[PDB]
Amino acid sequence: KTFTEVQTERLEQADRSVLIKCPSKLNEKKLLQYLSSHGKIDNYFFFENRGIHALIEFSEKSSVASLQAVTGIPKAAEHHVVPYKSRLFTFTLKNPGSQAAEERPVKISPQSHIPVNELIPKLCHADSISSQMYILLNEYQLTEENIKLRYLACSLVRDFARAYFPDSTVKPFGSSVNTFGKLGCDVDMFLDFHKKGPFEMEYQMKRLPSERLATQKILSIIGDCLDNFGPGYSSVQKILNARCPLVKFSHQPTGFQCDLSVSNSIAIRCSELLYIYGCLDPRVRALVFSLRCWARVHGLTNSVPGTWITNFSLTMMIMFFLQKRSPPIIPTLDQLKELADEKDKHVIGGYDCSFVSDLSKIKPTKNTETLDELLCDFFQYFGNFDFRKNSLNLRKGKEVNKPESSPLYIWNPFEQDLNISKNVNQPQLEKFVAMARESAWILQKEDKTQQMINKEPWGLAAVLIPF
Amino acid sequence: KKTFTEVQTERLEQADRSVLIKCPSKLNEKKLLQYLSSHGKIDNYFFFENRGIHALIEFSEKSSVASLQAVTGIPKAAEHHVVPYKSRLFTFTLKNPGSQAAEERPVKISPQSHIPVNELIPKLCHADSISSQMYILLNEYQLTEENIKLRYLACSLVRDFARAYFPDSTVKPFGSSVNTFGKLGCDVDMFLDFHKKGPFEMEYQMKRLPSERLATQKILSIIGDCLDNFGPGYSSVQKILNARCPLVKFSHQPTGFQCDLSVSNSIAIRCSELLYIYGCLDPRVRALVFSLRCWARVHGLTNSVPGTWITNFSLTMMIMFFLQKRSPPIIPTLDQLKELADEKDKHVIGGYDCSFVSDLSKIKPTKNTETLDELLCDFFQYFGNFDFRKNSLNLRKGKEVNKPESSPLYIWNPFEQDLNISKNVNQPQLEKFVAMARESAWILQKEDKTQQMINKEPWGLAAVLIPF
Ligand SMILES: Nc1ncnc2c1ncn2[C@@H]1O[C@H](COP(=O)(O)OP(=O)(O)OP(O)(O)=S)[C@@H](O)[C@H]1O
Ligand SMILES: Nc1ncnc2c1ncn2[C@@H]1O[C@H](COP(=O)(O)OP(=O)(O)OP(O)(O)=S)[C@@H](O)[C@H]1O
Ligand SMILES: [Mg+2]
């Protein structure tokens, strides 16, 4: 069960899935009975998105074509649609006024988490801090249904990209696949491209200077195509001049906000690294989900980029913390490099990104610290950390001198000599520290039993309300 | 024979299953065709010069293209410094250049441009009569079979981009490229065209378009950008989306053509078929057009760039009007062709009637036996004495009529009948046309042909194809 195996399997399942906008009067049994005539159905679910929608995952890829064969084109008076045929369908009843199976009803798989004000009560009603964090983790994490929906979005963009580039693939990365994803987070997608006789035979293709110019031209054209031809695509925004060129859009059927970029093979290795750490111990994920929520409540993070610390930066700080335990909760990257082999030996653009993929090759942690300790110690550790003189190196798992002058310096573990938190200024760092120290204080000085009895917030709940 | 539409469909189908291969410097024809034959049967092929030897290959089967593509790789210059759009443009090089092991036979190069005027004049002087001069010109200038395949292929390559999101699209050529009056070196005018199970009514989700002009502009804009950036070989891509008929101009380096891509001129296609019929009816028709069009170019009456000049197309219609006014007429009128049409040939587009026969046998041949010697001189005489102030040219009736609007030269658009196809022409350019017509008539009347032949001087067509 390696990261890459899972990706391939998830993509193959997304390959043979479809989305159906369901009728207002919905008969589950009749719908599945009909669709079963096109082939076996491995899995399905329903979700709410300006009407009831259904994801259908067939056992066979041929069932998609079968269904497409009996699907027609919409036909209006103005009658002007872009006739791109996808795997987005709309089912309506032939005779709507002759059907009265109104009270089914249908199980709706949620795609967003409960808001904080609903979550706080549940945390107060828990037994310990450790449980508060796991409750949060469970309300927030990606469900199996949401994950299928994400890979499908990639798959739909793949087919759309395959109009001009038939050998293309679109693989997700970042929070969507590194185990640290929460409901409502964006889908980060990257576009990838993959002898008898006397002649070497090649295509004629325009020779541009660098990857960068091609990348920009491709994304620009795909962008325009999504905007003008793509069904359910919207708010298309081209950001082709960033360090990593990128196109943003919202996909109405799945409801996701999406980021399409090209060939970032580094970010994939990073996604696998965080995948490993997330799989090694359940405390890792529990801790990240809570601290990331904490940062949002106190305005340390923000939706728009700027001087704020990013979830990703924060996540790496949390990993560094976990590397510095006695004994360490997770191994260092260098430790993972020494356990790698030739199969796991990836070198990309000069940098070494090699590390083990097999989980059993990693010796489990002897550490038995509870989350009560780890949460408070996180605030204590970074509330007393010397950010002027020290930087966070996740390869060595040690504090080291800063290569460059920067308020918060965190070492990019692959593209070394980059600071993943270069964007952070001193005002935002000082606010992080102040909130850390205040949160530590609250957790230390709180009389938990007294707060429970008084029907007041305590533990995680106390640090997840504004000060 | 066959009908205009049948030919188009057949030509496009053949272009559908053709490819262009940039050949090695050391070219072994036999070995190349032997290898390509392993991917399927080859109906036709030829070679042409264009910054190196290129080859058009027309397979019998469309599957042979995919077969060939399957064994074709990516160049890999810098490890993704190319745009990986895969087309039907290939580059063949030798695996081991040091293993050539056969005798070097040279290769037949099919020309794609005609000889220049200064080379043509001698050939015309050495001919027997004026009639022959015109047929010699016609033969040096007309489209070859190879050039025609190359034109339809260019359309086919442009089609492939458009079908990415409009799968039922066609890019069909029109104008001189297909109306029999095309000459080597003329541009390619292209237009883009778009044409009970269960208890559930099942439909695709598909993005709505805006109304025709805005869609057209968005589509051409995107195809334009694709030609420019996904390539290969497109160049000088120029978007002119705000014209009365939105349009994208470009030059295609592999085929060597200058191209005009627009959307849905179904009228201009009917016009192209009309001229096709006239061109097929009698060989004198084409002979006359090719000579007069050449005449106009030599005397600066026409020009490459649009403006106040008479256009080849306008001139061509004037020539058709002339031929309608013969005794007996050399070609039938459009109304005559409308009366011979049936339901199959009954085309009505945007309010206007564009119906006319497609079958050639339904048209009775012409009794007219006038030679080209007469027709050429009579053309100059007729229009040199024509009253352009009081008369307009109506090709439907085949008659001179009053001008609906005030315009120096008024020629009736035979389909969109509110319109003057030569509205662009001012009085200075019309007066120059008339002056050149009258002077050309005079030269042909007063020339002593035998005296000019003996003196090694220009005569007949050659005399009117040198500047005054
Ligand atoms: N400053 C950065 N330095 C190195 N890698 C980065 C940086 N920013 C983003 N990435 C990579 O791009 C991926 C996706 O970017 P983001 O969507 O912004 O972050 P995320 O990890 O998906 O968490 P979310 O979306 O805020 S829940 C990250 O996981 C990184 O692997
Ligand atoms: N003013 C016009 N009115 C009507 N149809 C026109 C007009 N101009 C061009 N067309 C159509 O467009 C076609 C091609 O346009 P042009 O390229 O300008 O003419 P052409 O017939 O191709 O002659 P060439 O290309 O100069 S050798 C013509 O056959 C006409 O069918
Ligand atoms: Mg993300």
Numbering used by the authors:
A (entry chain B): 52 to 245, 255 to 527
B (entry chain A): 51 to 245, 255 to 527
What does the published report state?
In mitochondria, mRNAs are polyadenylated by mtPAP.
The tails formed are composed almost exclusively of adenosine residues and to gain comprehensive understanding of mtPAP's ATP specificity, we determined the crystal structure of mtPAP complexed with the non-hydrolyzable ATP analog ATPγS in the presence of Mg2+. ATP is primarily recognized through its triphosphate moiety by residues from the palm and fingers domains. N6 of the adenine ring donates a hydrogen bond to the main-chain carbonyl group of I480, with the interatomic distance being 3.3 Å. We observed density for a second adenine ring from ATPγS that was stacked ∼4 Å from the primary ATPγS bound in the active site. Intriguingly, the Mg2+ coordination is distinct in the two protomers: in Mol-B, Mg2+ is coordinated by the carboxyl groups of the conserved residues D237 and D239, whereas in Mol-A, the side chain of D237 is flipped away 6 Å from the Mg2+.
